[PDB]
């Protein structure tokens, strides 16, 4: 196939964001450390889609990237507390329950995970859910 | 300028909490100028009290940076604007915004701490003798906080 090295992917990835000309303003993706080379840790935003017991929300997550990341999909965790199907109560993403991890493609990046999400919010069923009150944490 | 950055700054125009006003510099955007009314009916009231709050390199991983300008007596403000309240020291969570900060700060000034671990003389006043404390607290507020 060519398989793209984890460490030339997340280089991608990087590169991506410092491209990024600041359009896309309802996801970001970034690196957590400003030190590790090797990209582990990344911090997400999702801001909540309008219309929705989301909406406006700015809701932070931690992204990690392990020894397989793009082989196997990113560890995604919700900092900011959120009643969402694909999210369990300690705030992990769900690899069986979120579509993009279910059916995991490689191709698949970090931010698009992001956007993803933030459909998952604005879904007809979704968009009703409770939240707690805007600000909880885990 | 983080997307995060840039909504919290929007939020802090549109959506302060009542009482209190955040507003970034145009030299530094990660820069804010504050303030916080005194809370009625606290020995604060009637006062104008102003702030300054930084978002370092590393936010949101560590807190935002936060002190007083105001001259203000209070168990847990020191004499430059120093804050002791958990949230900004060892409480901190990436998930948190500037917007709880402040609220928090709003809070501690109707709700000081003066049994917080670190000793210092105003919060020893505060315990020895409250209602003189407040008494000064009240003489500060007129002479350093006038709107």
């Known amino acids: 196939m060519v398989e793209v090295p984890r460490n030339f992917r997340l280089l991608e990835e990087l590169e991506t964001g410092e491209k990024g000309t600041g359009s896309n303003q309802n996801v970001s993706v970034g690196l957590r450390d400003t030190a590790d080379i090797f990209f582990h840790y990344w911090n997400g935003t999702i801001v909540g889609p309008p219309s929705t017991t989301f909406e406006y929300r700015i809701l932070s997550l931690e992204i990690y990237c392990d020894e397989n990341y793009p082989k196997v999909p990113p560890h995604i965790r919700f900092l900011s507390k959120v009643n969402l199907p694909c999210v369990d109560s300690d705030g992990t993403v769900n690899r069986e329950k979120f579509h993009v991890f279910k059916h995991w493609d490689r191709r698949t990046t970090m931010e698009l995970c992001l956007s993803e999400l933030r459909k998952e919010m604005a879904q007809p069923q979704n968009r009703k859910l409770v939240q707690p009150p805007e600000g909880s944490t885990y | 300028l983080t997307t995060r950055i840039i909504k919290e700054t929007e939020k802090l125009q549109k959506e302060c909490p ?66 002791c309240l958990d949230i900004i020291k060892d409480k901190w969570s990436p998930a948190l915004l500037i917007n709880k900060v402040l609220l928090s700060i709003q809070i501690l000034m109707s709700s000081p701490n003066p049994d917080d671990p670190l000793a210092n003389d105003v919060a020893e006043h505060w315990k020895e003798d409250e209602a003189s404390a407040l008494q000064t607290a009240r003489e500060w507020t007129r002479k350093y906080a006038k709107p």
């Open chain 2, 18 to 83: 009542p009482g209190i006003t955040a507003t970034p510099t145009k030299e530094n955007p990660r820069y804010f100028m504050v303030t916080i009314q005194g809370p009625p009916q606290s020995c604060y009231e009637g006062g104008l009290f102003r702030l300054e709050l930084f978002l370092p390199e590393e936010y949101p991983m560590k807190p935002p940076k936060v002190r007083f300008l105001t001259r203000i007596y209070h168990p847990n403000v020191d004499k430059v604007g120093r804050i």
